[PDB]
Structures are given as structure tokens and as C-alpha cells.
Amino acid sequence: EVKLQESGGGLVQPGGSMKLSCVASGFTFNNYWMSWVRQSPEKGLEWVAEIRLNSDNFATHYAESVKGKFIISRDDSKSRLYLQMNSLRAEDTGIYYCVLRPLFYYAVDYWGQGTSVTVSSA
Amino acid sequence: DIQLTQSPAFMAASPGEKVTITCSVSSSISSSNLHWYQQKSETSPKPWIYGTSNLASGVPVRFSGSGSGTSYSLTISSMEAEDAATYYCQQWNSYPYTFGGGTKLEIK
């Protein structure tokens, strides 16, 4: 069971900042993890970020070419999962999927639908 | 970098055939952390298979997943016309989580 709706997409002169979002419904799943995956034609899909709630408040992890640049953040109290990206470039243009999976022994993660982000000078 | 690649890239299936797109890691991870996603043009990755053999809520039961070690595959009993997606595999073993180039099926 789930309902993930992400807001905030658009287009920014390069260098521009943003703040994708998505708010969880149904969940109050004691212990989950959430992360942002992105897809543009150039790269296909790529795990970008991921905050983590096993029960320690925050632990984050980023990758080869995103760290320095964005920071996952989310507070259950707020129900939301925010993702601010700074110093953006062409490369980063794509659709950001917001997927949350819970740490039950087993079941499967969920995904939402995305929004375009367009880094163009125009 | 941790790498999965998919044999093969594009397929062609007559309705009623049996398809199997394989997927394979660079380093031996474990069956139970290789998820399989299905994406149909004009929409977003649709969680298809979790575990190496678990189907997700709704996945028709003519579909089949299996593997252990470095080679995981996917197989469709009787290809039908709504399997015409592009499938992709994924690794949630160690960061970073990487994905396959994604195999594209299409219906003959």
C-alpha cells in the first residue's frame, strides 16, 4: 500500500538551485529507507541519493557525481522527503523518481511518477 | 563502480513464444538483492520482480525469475502483447546501487 507524489520540477539556468519533494501517504513504517533515482536518455536510470531510517535519525549516502551537489533530507514529522540540488549542470537534467522501501524482511519498494528538471541556459 | 549488463539489447517475440533476458553482476552479489523493473513507454519504472524470484503485486504469473551468483535471468512463459516493455535489473547489495542497460522487448 502507498501514495507518493513528488512536486517541484521545472527548469533552471545552469547553476540554479531546486528542491524536489514528495510526501509519503499510508506509511508510518517504523523503519524504511528512501532515495532519489533519475532517468534521462543520455544515462538511463541512476541511483542519485538516499537518506536512511533503520532507526538512527539520519545516515545519508551519495555517489560519483552528485555529492557536494545535492543533499537528501526528510522529516517524518513533516511526512515529506526533500531533495535540494545545487550547482546544477546539463548532465543532471532528467526525471527524478522518488522511491521508498521499507525494511520488512520482505516485500518490495515503491515508486512514484517523477517530474522533469531541465538545466538549460535558454 | 559496480556493474550489471543485459544480454541482449533488443528482442523480437511472436505472440506465444518464451523469452529470457539474462542479467549479470561484475562481483558475486546475492540473489536476494537483485530487483527487476519493467518500464512501458510514456511512464515510470514499474517494480516487477523482487528477490530473485518474487513477483510484485500484479505481475502476471506467466513470468519467471531465477539465478544465483553472477547470472540472473527473467523468462516469460507465453510472450503476449503487454510484455512489450523495456525491462531493467538492479543491485541494492552495496552502494552504489547500479542498474542494467535494460533489455527492450517488442512484439512481432
Q: Please report residues of B whose CB lies closer than 8 A to that of A46.
A: 99
Is B50 within 8 Å of A109 when comparing Cβ atoms?
Answer: yes
Interface test with B, best of A40, A109, A113 (most B CBs within 10 A): A109
B87 close contact with A: CB closer than 8 A: no
Indicate the resolution in Å: 18.0
CB of B100 within 8 A of CB of B93? Answer: no
List, in order of start, the domains of chain B with CATH numbers: 19-104 (2.60.40.10)
Q: Topology of A3-119 in CATH?
A: Immunoglobulin-like (2.60.40)
Burial degree of A95 (CB within 10 A; 0-12, 13-18, 19+): middle
Which candidate from A95, A97, A106 shows the least CB-CB separation from B51?
A106
Instruction: Measure the CA angle with vertex A96, ends A93 and A100; round to 5°.
Output: 160
| Interface residue A112 vs chain B (CB under 8 A) | yes
Touching A: B residues 42-71, CB under 8 Å: 43-47, 50-51, 54, 56-57
Residue A70 to residues A101, A114, A115, B50, B102, Cα–Cα distance (Å): 21, 17, 17, 28, 26
Cα–Cα distance between B3 and A86 in angstroms, integer? 28
Contact A52, A64 (CB under 8 A): no
Breaks in chain A after (C-N > 2.5 angstroms): none
Residue B80 at interface with chain A, using a CB cutoff of 8 Å: no
Q: Is A97 on the interface with B (CB under 8 A)?
A: yes
> Quick check: A108 and B50 CB within 8 A?
yes
Residue the block writes with cell 517530474: A115
Using left for φ > 0, alpha for ψ between -120 and 50, and beta otherwise, residue A15 falls in: left
